[PDB]
Design a protein around this ligand. Structure first.
Ligand SMILES: Nc1nc2c(ncn2[C@@H]2O[C@H](COP(=O)(O)OP(=O)(O)O)[C@@H](O)[C@H]2O)c(=O)[nH]1
Lengths: 320, 21
């Protein structure tokens, strides 16, 4: 059997579900126009959810609206919140969102997203409001990629590429159906650990004993060094590099690593993080890590990175 | 514990900003 088992791991919001969808676009035949239609309701809901999250955050952070006229829209949003659930973004609704998203109070809060929890499909959807507001609208494949869906168990995708049968599991965060879950961790060719680089500047939340980056690290530390994984490739996806590059211009990496004596260039910071992770590997003679810098929402990039990952797998099983 | 740590970690998404299918 030329069969390859790939397990995706990493904190929530690290890009795992996206990598899965992306395999479908790249190596299966994508999403058919019918399937795209099915995500219409999802796109609408996420857009609604995203703006609500910003609005609610305004209260907590105590940020006043740019124009106090928008207060009505805030109240109106909650009334209309369900207006799209099976159908259409009525015009009224588009108006509310459009006007809120434009407001400077909202925006100042959107800038301060490190201070709360704003999903990374927010900007994407809200800036394309005009396009998705159309009654005739059919979600593009880039739109389907950007959808945020609750799953309640193991996510799987399979494809054939370069004469190899690929099985990929995003095991997710649900223990229910426990034997099949544990099995995802068994007979794995390669583990692909995802990291959201852009988490580096997130405020230490009231429910955490260390920042998100160190949480990710601790996780990687235990995966990498687990004796069950001795003969499993460890592949590291330092993801969300697009957002990381923008943030690092303004927020110092010392926010995340106080001891960091380097500089706030994308290049130098990214290299520092990679080292922070790779240094966690405690069996360096018997194991190397395969680091990749990705933007998971970018098909072309994933295609290239995954192609590379495959080539290593091929060159690997030529120990026969 | 190895499996716990993973479970708890990957569960921490933003579920008020996702949706059922
Ligand atoms: N800008 C940007 N957004 C991303 C990137 N990777 C993922 N996202 C978005 O970030 C969020 C988390 O992605 P997801 O795959 O659902 O993470 P998971 O929680 O590990 O499954 C989603 O809104 C994605 O569409 C990236 O590299 N750049």
């Amino acid at each position: 059997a030329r069969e390859v088992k790939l397990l995706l791991l990493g904190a929530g919001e690290s890009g795992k579900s996206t990598i899965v969808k992306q395999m479908k676009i790249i190596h299966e035949a994508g999403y058919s126009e019918e399937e795209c239609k099915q995500y219409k309701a999802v796109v609408y809901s996420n857009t609604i959810q995203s703006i609500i999250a910003i609005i609610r955050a305004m209260g907590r952070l105590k940020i006043d609206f740019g124009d106090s006229a928008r207060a009505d829209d805030a109240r109106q949003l909650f009334v209309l919140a369900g207006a799209a659930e099976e159908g259409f973004m009525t015009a009224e609704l588009a108006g509310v969102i459009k006007r809120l998203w434009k407001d400077s109070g909202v925006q100042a809060c959107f800038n301060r997203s490190r201070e709360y929890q704003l999903n990374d499909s927010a900007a994407y959807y809200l800036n394309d409001l005009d396009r998705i507001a159309q009654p005739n609208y059919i979600p593009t494949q880039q739109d389907v990629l950007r959808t945020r869906v609750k799953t309640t168990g193991i996510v799987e995708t399979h494809f054939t590429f370069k004469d190899l049968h690929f099985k990929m599991f995003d095991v997710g965060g649900q223990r229910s159906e426990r034997k099949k879950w544990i099995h995802c961790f068994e007979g794995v060719t390669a583990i692909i650990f995802c990291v959201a680089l852009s988490d580096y500047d997130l405020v230490l939340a009231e429910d955490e004993e260390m920042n998100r980056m160190h949480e990710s690290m601790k996780l990687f530390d235990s995966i990498c060094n687990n004796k069950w994984f001795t003969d499993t490739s460890i592949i590291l996806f330092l993801n969300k590099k697009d957002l990381f590059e923008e943030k690092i211009k303004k927020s110092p990496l010392t926010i995340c690593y106080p001891e960091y004596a380097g500089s706030n260039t994308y290049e130098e910071a990214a290299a520092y993080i990679q080292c922070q992770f790779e240094d966690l590997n405690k069996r360096k003679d018997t194991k190397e890590i395969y680091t990749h810098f990705t933007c998971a929402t970018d098909t072309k990039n994933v295609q290239f990175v995954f192609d590379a990952v495959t080539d290593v797998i091929i060159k690997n099983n030529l120990k026969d | 514990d190895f499996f716990s740590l993973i479970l708890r970690s990957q569960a921490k998404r933003m579920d008020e900003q996702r949706v059922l299918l």
